[PDB]
Amino acid sequence: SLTADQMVSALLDAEPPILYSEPFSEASMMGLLTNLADRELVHMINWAKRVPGFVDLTLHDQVHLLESAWLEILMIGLVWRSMEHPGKLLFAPNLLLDRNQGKSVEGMVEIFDMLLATSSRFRMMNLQGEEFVCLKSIILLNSGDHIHRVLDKITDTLIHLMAKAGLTLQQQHQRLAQLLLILSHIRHMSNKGMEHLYSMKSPLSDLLLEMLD
Amino acid sequence: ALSLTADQMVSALLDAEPPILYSEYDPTMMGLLTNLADRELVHMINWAKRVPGFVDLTLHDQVHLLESAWLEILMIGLVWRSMEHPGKLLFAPNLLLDRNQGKSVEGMVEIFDMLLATSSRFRMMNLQGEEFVCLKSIILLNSGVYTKDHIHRVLDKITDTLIHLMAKAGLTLQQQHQRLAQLLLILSHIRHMSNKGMEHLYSLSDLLLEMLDA
Ligand SMILES: CC/C(=C(\c1ccc(O)cc1)c1ccc(OCCN(C)C)cc1)c1ccccc1
Ligand SMILES: CC/C(=C(\c1ccc(O)cc1)c1ccc(OCCN(C)C)cc1)c1ccccc1
């Protein structure tokens, strides 16, 4: 219903805050991130409810979308924070880790490097905040009819941002392609992430349902 | 390679297309799929070498891109040929499985329904052959690009090719970048399905370098 520019403003206003973290072992480092993550998830839900077209979906669909996309969203949020910190990841203002410390957790050295590669790619493209919030909304809606019309609106919005940037048509859809292809790499990183979290001993849906309702 | 046109890009990719192989005739499942995939893999190497700008890369990079994308390439091919067979996957012309047949297969418990939905998606989008071969080429160059400027230059060109096909088809410019977005978002799902497959298979850098010595 809305215009390409008020879509930007609405999403920007719905942006979650940057939370603070609470040598490392494997269990203490994953304790830090899990905590930050679970705190971060509360704010993600409130953000999702303010993404245009989300609350119009059934509760069953809202939960399902967040359930499959939550790690993707945390990761692209992490990458966005670490953009101006080459060779490092900004989990929190009080938790900036280089590649060296990432070996505290086994199997995390691979995922770590994939996040750093994404961060450099965003810097190479000089990703804007107006585009970032658009990419993040797409992730929430795509990873899981009405949804596609909303997704089609975000595409127009992204194009609108690139057209106002002074870009000709060729560089516009080229950049659009470049951006969306990164999401495939983000999905990949999430998949490898779920594995590791599954490779651990023992409520998201409970948290999702509790806060969404 | 960077100086081709959209029509020359399409023409090169279409003639680079691998043949649809058959499952081994033996009247008297993962074994059949493994056998089929390994024979398909040999044709994939020949195809990849015909993808514009792929041979401009080093031998090491060619191996890396293929080891990262091979299952995605096989899966999108599976989805493509299963398009006009609703609610059923066409692994081979003589190996056609529907859902209940597929539910009883090793670890295809998750991806079968995903592959069908992807096939449903392409069908209701009316995916053209010219678009398909473009998407498959994109997969080849993009899957391992993060795990280099020439690669992104070829990708941008395949993007230019896709847009041209949509403009010629008679789509408005708004419909053009919308369709392009839809197609590329699907690649995320295909990446997702591949990961699910790789894991199950996990329970190479070698053989590729062997095949590309040709
Ligand atoms: C990439 C860092 C990370 C997590 C993370 C990323 C971004 C962010 O802002 C916060 C954390 C991470 C770690 C643990 C985690 O667990 C939450 C789920 N619990 C309830 C099991 C989630 C994300 C991670 C995820 C999986 C495996 C290893 C590490
Ligand atoms: C989706 C069907 C499939 C295979 C397949 C897909 C498309 C195609 O055209 C042909 C086959 C599949 C099955 C086995 C397989 O193994 C080859 C590698 N071997 C040496 C381990 C590859 C793909 C599969 C992949 C992973 C797990 C379970 C099934």
Numbering used by the authors:
A (entry chain B): 309 to 330, 336 to 457, 473 to 530, 535 to 545
B (entry chain A): 307 to 334, 342 to 460, 472 to 527, 536 to 546
Paper text:
The pro-oncogenic cellular activities of estrogen receptor alpha (ERα) drive breast cancer pathogenesis. Ligand-dependent transcriptional activities depend on the association of coactivator proteins with ERα to form functional complexes. SERMs and SERDs elicit a structural rearrangement of the ERα LBD to sterically preclude binding of coactivators in the activating function-2 cleft. Activating somatic mutations near ERα helix 12, Y537S and D538G, enable hormone therapy resistance in metastatic ER +breast cancers.
